[PDB]
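Subject: mismatched residue count in predicted assembly?

I count 560 residues in my input, but I want to confirm that the predicted structure covers every chain. Input:
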Amino acid sequence: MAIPAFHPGELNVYSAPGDVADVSRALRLTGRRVMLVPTMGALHEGHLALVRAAKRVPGSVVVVSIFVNPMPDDDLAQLRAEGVEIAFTPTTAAMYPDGLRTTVQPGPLAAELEGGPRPTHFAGVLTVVLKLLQIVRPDRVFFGEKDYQQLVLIRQLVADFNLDVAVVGVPTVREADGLAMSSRNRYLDPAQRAAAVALSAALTAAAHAATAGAQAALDAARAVLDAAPGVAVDYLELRDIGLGPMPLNGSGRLLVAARLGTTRLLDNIAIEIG
Amino acid sequence: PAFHPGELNVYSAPGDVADVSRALRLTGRRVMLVPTMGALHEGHLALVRAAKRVPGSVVVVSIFVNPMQFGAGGDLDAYPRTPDDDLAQLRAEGVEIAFTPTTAAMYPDGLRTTVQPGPLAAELEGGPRPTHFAGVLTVVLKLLQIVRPDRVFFGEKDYQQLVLIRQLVADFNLDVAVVGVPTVREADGLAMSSRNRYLDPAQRAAAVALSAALTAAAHAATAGAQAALDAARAVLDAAPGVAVDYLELRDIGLGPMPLNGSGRLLVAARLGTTRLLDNIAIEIGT
Ligand SMILES: COc1ccc2c(c1)cc(C(=O)NS(=O)(=O)c1nnc(NC(C)=O)s1)n2CC(=O)O
Ligand SMILES: COc1ccc2c(c1)cc(C(=O)NS(=O)(=O)c1nnc(NC(C)=O)s1)n2CC(=O)O
Ligand SMILES: COc1ccc2c(c1)cc(C(=O)NS(=O)(=O)c1nnc(NC(C)=O)s1)n2CC(=O)O
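Triage response: the counts match. Full output below for your records.
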């Protein structure tokens, strides 16, 4: 049967998985490289940074998915203003026509850090990311480094299941004072918003303290967190770039999570030791 | 990698078969995958023949004894391995690609991300082997991603496995058609199996009771479900040294729905240490 209509240079919106699959296949056959930016809508400047990263690949056609995963006019207007040509907006029923059945089970990393208090959270994410990859079949898929544990788990999924996509991590877009962009930032009252800059300040202080070794980096970040009121730290850990044990010197990642009132915030940063 | 058309080309490295497959697909060939654990018999050859019949096909047969689907034990070590006979049979059938990866190339990081099947994996064969089908679907997903076939071929003999594979394909939006091929049988009705070689002469004589029980049931079924089950039970009971593990009549999808007009009757039984499975389509009142 017929490929659904695709109008080059305009925003084309599809909610049926088979439709975007068919258009994506047709476009790839035409000499486009299909770039996927998965989102849950309510798009912000961090999402736009993913889009801009994707658009600049020569030959790109950009697919932005908007799917709120149980396990609008404004969004489309922003994507049109960015020159995005495909929005994929499926219903929960289209994604899960047989309900919850076969799912992805992450490796033991999912049980650490964010996976601590609820060991099935990343299973939901990795399941939908796998489905979006198979539907759209992109050459590259773009995520922010903000949810870094998530991002490492997606790289694990791609390696472990032999998937033919490149995973591109885009540096986290931040507010002017360093706070990492987040849908949750608008819930902070002004005292909480002022205190919240300690997460990014702690991590940047650590990244610079790290010429003096790992202990100095951790101690500098802890002192900065300790200078902030109402910031209940859930963890502060230095790991290697794959989230295993930090090697004695070399590259790592420093991750923090804290609760301010009812709002949980996360941040992370690249660390080079000595 | 080199690909010599009309000859059997053997690749161990996943990257080799993936590149060859992609190159053939881009030039118009349709890639057919038949995933096996080796020890090939005529039942496997029927899969290969179904694949070859597809116009313009190139057939890739994988042979990999997947450690993730064995629970035990010496079950893994005990699995039959006959790779010389296997490659000889593939050459005779005109297969152009065999994919024979190492365990290290499939699982370089060990068990890490895996497929978790839905609730059907804990029933029937999965009841006492709760991780068996996660091992199967994890390997089948990986072979599908490596080879990217148009169609993949499985026997109906492991019917529960086939249904789980259809679930994997639907649930992860995989772009591959699953083809189920009817069970090839010996002249007496015995389902072909790599495991039939572990039947001694007495047990091989007795083993005809599984298929005899199932066909008796499929004919009895005009008189309803109880008659079909009782006919199969009667045949299994008349058989020396057959220990029935389960005999169950389910809807065709084996899912959370009652039997209607179409059923699958499944049997598992032990002859000494050898566990045999068989199944058949059943039409009730009809
Ligand atoms: C390049 O800079 C950035 C900076 C922040 C970003 C992003 C990019 C992308 C997001 C983001 O969360 N997008 S999302 O809602 O589609 C998600 N992606 N993964 C999520 N995981 C969970 C567990 O919700 S939510 N966020 C955070 C946020 O919106 O809350
Ligand atoms: C306007 O001039 C060009 C021309 C080519 C470009 C770009 C710009 C940008 C990219 C590109 O790779 N962008 S990206 O965001 O997908 C990546 N950045 N790093 C990547 N890979 C790794 C391993 O870090 S992918 N590329 C394609 C490339 O570099 O492969
Ligand atoms: C069309 O006719 C048939 C008939 C029987 C078949 C086949 C084809 C294929 C097989 C077979 O075992 N295929 S396999 O190597 O990919 C396996 N599939 N599931 C397996 N499960 C276990 C527990 O060994 S082994 N088998 C059954 C077998 O070897 O027991």
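DSSP finds ten helices and ten strands in chain B. Marking this ticket as 'not a bug'.
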